[PDB]
Amino acid sequence: QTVIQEPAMSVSPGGTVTLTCAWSSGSVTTSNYPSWFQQTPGQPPRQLIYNTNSRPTGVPRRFSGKISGNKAALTITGAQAEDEADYFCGLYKRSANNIFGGGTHLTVL
Amino acid sequence: GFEYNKVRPHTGTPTLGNKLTFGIPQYGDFFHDMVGHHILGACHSSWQDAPIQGTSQMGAHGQLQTFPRNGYDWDNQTPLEGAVYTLVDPFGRPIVPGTKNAYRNLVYYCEYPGERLYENVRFDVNGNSLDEYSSDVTTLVRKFCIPGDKMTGYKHLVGQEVSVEGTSGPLLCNIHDLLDIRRNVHYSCNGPQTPKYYQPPLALWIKLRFWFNENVNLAIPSVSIPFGERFITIKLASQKDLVNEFPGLFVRQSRFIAGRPSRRNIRFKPWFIPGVINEISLTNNELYINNLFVLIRVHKTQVTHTNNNHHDEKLMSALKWPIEYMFIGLKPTWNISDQNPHQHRDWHKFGHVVNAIMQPTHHAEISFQDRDTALPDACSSISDISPVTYPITLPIIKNISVTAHGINLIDKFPSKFCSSYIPFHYGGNAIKTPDDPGAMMITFALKPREEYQPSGHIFYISWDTDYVGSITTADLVVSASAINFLL
Amino acid sequence: GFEYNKVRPHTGTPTLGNKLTFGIPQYGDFFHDMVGHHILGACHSSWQDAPIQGTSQMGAHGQLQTFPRNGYDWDNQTPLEGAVYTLVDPFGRPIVPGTKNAYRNLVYYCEYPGERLYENVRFDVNGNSLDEYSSDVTTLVRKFCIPGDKMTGYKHLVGQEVSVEGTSGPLLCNIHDLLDIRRNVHYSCNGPQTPKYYQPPLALWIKLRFWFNENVNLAIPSVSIPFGERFITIKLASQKDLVNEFPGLFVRQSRFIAGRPSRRNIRFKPWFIPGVINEISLTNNELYINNLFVLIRVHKTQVTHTNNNHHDEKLMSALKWPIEYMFIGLKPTWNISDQNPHQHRDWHKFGHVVNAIMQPTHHAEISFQDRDTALPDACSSISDISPVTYPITLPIIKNISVTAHGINLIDKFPSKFCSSYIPFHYGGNAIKTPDDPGAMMITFALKPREEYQPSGHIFYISWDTDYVGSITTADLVVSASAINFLL
Amino acid sequence: EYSSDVTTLVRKFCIPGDKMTGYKHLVGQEVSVEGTSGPLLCNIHDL
């Protein structure tokens, strides 16, 4: 059992992008607690969203989290040029705890 | 069998916050008492949106209503480990936050809507208003003159909820003498002041009190003066002064305090965002006049606002007629203030109101190991959604005093003397003692209601309180059973 | 506007348990009624030491208060597996046993302190006491003559708590006809009888009742006899007779009953060790006399003590004047006895007092396995710290009888006849029916209070009870509205 | 000649509230005995 992300999207500056992460088998319940992380290259990963809709202090307001259908979605509205980074989704399975995705490289054109 | 005439309003199409006008036509011989009948329409708050987690929104009465993130306190910037927040309906049903048109606020009515509806009532005969009173005189004569046997009748007339008594069932009990089956009795309310999603249309039957509504022998004739010139003017209260809102959304906070024992405190904080209450339609607005077929006691009332500290001497010049027993109530201005969250519940209270909150938790301690079994392995602290609020009327006056023109008269009498003893000894069966310690009375005759004969009559008002200051003020309202002559 | 004169005590510096003297000076024309005002000071029990575990200490009223060891029962010599004991506050806060000056007892006030304070009141005119009564006559006329409208006033005057009514909130409910949002109404008390750590200073306004305090036409003049010779002698009650103690420490017993299910019963047993109450300083002791500017009904009372079995004939010779409606109450001697733990709560009760106890547990059953799931894997029985004690007044008399000189008069009438029916039919609005079944009345006239005219008047007392024996006794108190002549 | 309904009507209307407990004791109706629980935490909110 693993979590899968798509490899990449590209977004125009000032546009809205929706990254998706999903379980290989089954649904992504809100009890799986998706957590989205942003890693600028040359920098450690940063906590963007925990518990599917909440943001720690210092995270900009443009990041939003949701669960759509049977997957978790990170929506960036009005993405700037500082968002070009590697984006990781992590789901809390009961036995294996946090399982992190492969990583989606968001390209800001 | 005398009939009640159903006279329509003179102005027509009445609206809350606007003046209402009644006329007195000629259909009988004498008119003794009159009653305003209204049907208030249904009330329901507008549908709102459940907030997204982490969003703190400006709310009512200067309160920042917060739906904080997981792991933080009620303040959204204070960490609190283990705290997980959900949105629940006041009955415990989930809301799924973010869903539009799911949160709808429950709506009150104010306590005693029939008193607050007739905010200012005056009677005119080609102008020159003979009688004029307000809602404060009505709640004073409710607290003093209306007997306890007819208390449920007055509560049904003005649309106050009455306590329905039910029973639980047989219980274990014990008998300690130095075993028996016993039922538990509970009280609950389903009336207007109960917060409801859809308040039903309500029947207000407000009695009109004048000098000629007491004795049938003192009822004024309908032929001595023309019926055209007799008019009644009422100032109806606003919709915001009659209907309040209850928080229709509660942030439910689970909190796992790790350790031995591992407590799980679950609390509920209301999410109060004001909506748009629908406009109240006044339907079947009638006035019932008892036009039966075939010296006076005019009550002179006045309202004063006071802000002095430790000595508040107020002099009046309107009172010229001799004065019998006199009810005085010093209501705080914050009671009827719009900034009061409990304005609707605590408007009819002449003392400093506070709230005692029960938070009855459901404590349960569970052990897992079957080996250690001394300190429990887990606990639980499930609180109720709505905490129990007792309104306490703390006294507002320490030493009331009424000084006459030349003699001392009433000088620094304690409020418990004028609020409890004087209603207890003077007045007889008609004058009950009010439950409100702020409301009090000053007596001037030996026989207030025991006989229809003047047994004593006749001016400053002063209290040495400890509540009224620069930011805290007060409102004196009076009701004196003065005597007038009519010819 | 008649004034109230504030006459100081004649003796001065009054102390509980000592005599108090009042004089009547000359300032007005007639004096009708008078009220004793006393501000009792603060009450707080002395700081005590939390006991070490295993120590059993002698307590109050012949009870051995035990803080037993873990694994033993409440009896310290009886094994009880799984029992773990902790010391908690009545509010649930831990005490850390062995710590000096942590346990402080909560303090009652007795029910109706204003009645118990004036334990014996007499009026003297150069000696030769014209009127003399006790606290029992005061509680009898409270139960009978004081109406229900003025009940809250009398409870505020004599310092009795009144039940403040609050509401919980909206609830689910159901409607079964062969759904609706409903609020739940609770009652709570914050007054003197509530056990508190620090009792606030209290304003007793005790009414003085004499033969001339009823009708203003029958008020005795202040000029017919000199004002110097008129004296009032009152016997104030003891400090222990007014203020009682509540257990400020509770032994909390967790008990793990191993098995399937594995119950965890948690109970609370009070730790009651008497302390030293600080002395109540009577402050602002005054007598309010209504000295206004410009045949009799003397009540003859007596108190008797009885110890006979199955037939208790008592004859009196003090009653010589004609006797109108009469109130008699047979209070058990154990009610006012010092050995009674509930002496303060049950003193004003003319029936046999017992206690029915709610012990409302918070039951919760939890299963861990997710496979067996039929019988729960654990349970919980968390009780409240303070159990709910309803005081019940079982009837004291089976067949009351009053035999005259030559005729049978009252012969073996049941107590429910003389305690419920006679107040219901005879007396009118003034004479209410007491809630206490032990208190009863015997009528002699058709119109007790309906008119001011003698409509019938005139002697043994006998009851065929089943409680009074060798170790159980009783106390008869009377109040007869006799008629006297004054010239 | 009357029935039980006349009796309950005159109880509801004519019998006063002071004598309500007396009538409830005469016709054998239960009366609510009032008891107390004990000291509790509570709160005071003033604004």
Side-chain angles (χ1 to χ4, degrees), chain B residues 166-171 182-186:
Chain B
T167 61
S168 88
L171 305 168
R182 171 180 294 272
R183 194 153 79 169
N184 216 353
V185 161
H186 301 146

Side-chain angles (χ1 to χ4, degrees), chain A residues 52-108:
Chain A
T52 74
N53 53 7
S54 68
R55 277 167 300 262
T57 49
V59 170
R61 274 311 81 191
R62 64 180 165 270
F63 299 107
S64 78
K66 62 166 175 294
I67 286 181
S68 61
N70 264 357
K71 62 189 68 208
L74 175 59
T75 300
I76 321 182
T77 67
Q80 316 202 359
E82 293 179 353
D83 285 326
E84 195 185 61
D86 276 330
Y87 282 51
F88 304 96
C89 175
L91 312 184
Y92 188 86
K93 206 174 68 175
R94 303 259 308 120
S95 53
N97 304 289
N98 294 313
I99 303 169
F100 293 105
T104 302
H105 186 99
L106 183 85
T107 306
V108 179

Side-chain angles (χ1 to χ4, degrees), chain B residues 62-84:
Chain B
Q63 305 282 67
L64 184 52
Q65 283 303 349
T66 66
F67 180 30
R69 304 161 280 167
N70 294 9
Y72 281 74
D73 210 357
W74 294 117
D75 291 331
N76 205 12
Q77 64 210 48
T78 317
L80 192 73
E81 320 202 350
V84 187

Side-chain angles (χ1 to χ4, degrees), chain B residues 189-428:
Chain B
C189 277
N190 208 354
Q193 288 85 75
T194 304
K196 290 176 174 178
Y197 275 133
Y198 174 80
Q199 282 279 339
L202 188 154
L204 291 164
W205 299 83
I206 308 152
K207 197 189 170 184
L208 277 296
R209 298 154 156 89
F210 294 115
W211 75 89
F212 56 93
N213 299 151
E214 314 303 318
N215 289 119
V216 295
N217 308 79
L218 306 176
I220 56 170
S222 192
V223 75
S224 175
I225 54 173
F227 61 96
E229 59 189 25
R230 290 177 273 216
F231 264 70
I232 305 143
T233 303
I234 309 106
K235 196 261 180 174
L236 308 180
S238 296
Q239 176 182 1
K240 73 151 193 304
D241 272 4
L242 271 170
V243 169
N244 189 359
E245 296 175 355
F246 190 76
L249 180 57
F250 281 79
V251 186
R252 162 187 211 262
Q253 169 197 41
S254 299
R255 192 198 170 192
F256 184 87
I257 308 177
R260 261 176 46 79
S262 73
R263 273 174 318 282
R264 292 207 45 110
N265 309 342
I266 288 188
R267 308 272 184 266
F268 298 85
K269 186 72 72 71
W271 173 271
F272 196 45
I273 292 304
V276 177
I277 314 166
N278 78 312
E279 175 92 342
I280 305 191
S281 57
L282 266 75
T283 300
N284 296 115
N285 304 295
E286 321 195 60
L287 189 76
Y288 284 61
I289 279 161
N290 192 1
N291 265 322
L292 73 164
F293 300 92
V294 165
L295 191 65
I296 76 182
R297 309 202 177 276
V298 168
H299 321 94
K300 295 179 78 65
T301 77
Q302 66 183 357
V303 170
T304 45
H305 176 259
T306 47
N307 57 89
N308 288 67
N309 197 5
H310 196 257
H311 42 279
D312 205 322
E313 306 166 354
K314 290 276 153 301
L315 59 88
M316 69 226 79
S317 71
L319 274 298
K320 305 173 288 226
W321 279 280
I323 301 164
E324 203 180 0
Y325 64 94
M326 183 177 177
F327 314 117
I328 51 172
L330 183 63
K331 182 197 304 183
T333 308
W334 184 68
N335 273 7
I336 59 180
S337 179
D338 206 350
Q339 325 287 333
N340 193 355
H342 312 301
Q343 163 198 1
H344 295 70
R345 191 204 63 202
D346 293 78
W347 82 272
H348 61 99
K349 279 166 182 166
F350 305 99
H352 182 42
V353 292
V354 298
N355 304 283
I357 280 168
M358 295 296 173
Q359 198 69 260
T361 77
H362 287 299
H363 197 76
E365 308 208 336
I366 303 295
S367 186
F368 305 153
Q369 195 163 354
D370 210 354
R371 305 184 59 197
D372 192 44
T373 62
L375 215 51
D377 283 340
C379 288
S380 180
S381 175
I382 313 301
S383 174
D384 291 331
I385 298 186
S386 297
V388 180
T389 58
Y390 306 94
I392 298 92
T393 296
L394 306 171
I396 199 66
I397 288 174
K398 277 195 75 53
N399 296 115
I400 197 63
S401 62
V402 172
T403 69
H405 298 70
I407 62 171
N408 208 359
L409 206 69
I410 306 292
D411 203 32
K412 283 160 156 179
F413 282 171
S415 75
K416 195 168 280 188
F417 178 81
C418 294
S419 165
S420 291
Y421 170 62
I422 304 185
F424 167 63
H425 182 81
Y426 294 120

